[PDB]
């Protein structure tokens, strides 16, 4: 699974359109910038995407929220740090690494598979689900099919939190909420850890970005 994403909170909402030419002349490249207003049914976000020349930056902003924006990136390129420092210098923002608490990791898991269609209908792309724990180590795995049945047995928009985790407690006596979760793995799709997210394709779901931005809010 090729793409490891890191996350930085940003102290101010940035309009990258305004600063981009400076970044181009600094890197000697013509950076590709894409700007999209997105809606995540439940609010509305501004999403920037930035491709250099496998190095990629994604930004999610919301004017209504106290922490208005964060960015994430993937790739191991030398120039990632150039972009970060450039951001700090050009905009005087304060940027900090984001770490996901356990409850957040479960939400990110839900956000990775759940989505809503045009006619406002819940859909879920199910994958085999592995939870790792480190008290020395062990893991529990639920194949795709039982996930799917367990979920349709329930009402959803939070299948891991409303179906899978309770089914685990109710059928095995293991309380996921009481154990030291280290990662959630959705086979062929995504790996959610405390300090990063790994993906199989070169992007993160919009709902996942939304959940990140909401998790870094101060109270």
Curated annotation (Swiss-Prot):
Coiled coil: none annotated. It comes from Saccharomyces cerevisiae (strain ATCC 204508 / S288c) (Baker's yeast). It is found in: Nucleus; Chromosome, Centromere, Kinetochore. Forms a heterodimer with IML3. CHL4-IML3 is part of a larger constitutive centromere-associated network (CCAN) (also known as central kinetochore CTF19 complex in yeast), which is composed of at least AME1, CHL4, CNN1, CTF3, CTF19, IML3, MCM16, MCM21, MCM22, MHF1, MHF2, MIF2, NKP1, NKP2, OKP1 and WIP1. Interacts with CHL4 and CTF19. Belongs to the CENP-L/IML3 family. Disulfide bonds: none annotated. One of its GO terms (biological process) is cell division. Transmembrane segments: none annotated. Component of the kinetochore, a multiprotein complex that assembles on centromeric DNA and attaches chromosomes to spindle microtubules, mediating chromosome segregation and sister chromatid segregation during meiosis and mitosis. Component of the inner kinetochore constitutive centromere-associated network (CCAN), which serves as a structural platform for outer kinetochore assembly. Keywords: Cell cycle, Cell division, Centromere, Chromosome, Kinetochore, Meiosis, Mitosis, Nucleus. CDD domains: IML3 (cd22875). Present with 125 molecules/cell in log phase SD medium. GO terms for cellular component: kinetochore; nucleus; outer kinetochore. The gene is IML3. This is Inner kinetochore subunit IML3. It comes from the Eukaryota.
């Amino acid at each position: 699974m090729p793409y490891t994403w890191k996350f930085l909170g940003i102290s101010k909402q940035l309009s990258l359109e305004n600063g981009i030419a400076k970044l181009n002349q600094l890197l000697n490249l013509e950076v590709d910038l894409d700007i999209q207003t997105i809606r995540v049914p439940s609010d509305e976000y501004i999403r920037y995407e930035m491709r250099l020349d496998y190095s990629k930056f994604i930004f999610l902003g919301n004017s209504k929220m106290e922490v208005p924006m964060f960015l994430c990136y993937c790739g191991t390129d030398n120039r990632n740090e150039v972009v970060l420092q450039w951001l700090k210098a050009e905009y005087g923002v304060i940027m900090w690494p984001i770490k996901f608490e356990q409850k957040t990791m479960i939400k990110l898991a839900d956000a990775s598979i759940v989505h809503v269609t045009k006619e406002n209908i819940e859909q879920i792309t199910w994958f085999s689900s592995k939870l790792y724990f480190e008290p020395r180590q062990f893991s529990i795995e639920i194949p795709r099919e039982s996930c799917e049945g367990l979920a349709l047995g329930y009402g959803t928009m939070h299948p891991y939190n409303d179906a899978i985790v309770p089914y685990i407690y109710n059928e095995t006596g293991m309380a996921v909420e009481r154990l030291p979760l280290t990662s959630v793995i959705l086979a062929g799709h995504t790996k959610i850890m405390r300090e990063s997210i790994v993906t199989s394709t070169r992007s993160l779901r919009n709902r996942v970005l939304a959940v990140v931005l909401q998790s870094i809010q101060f109270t």
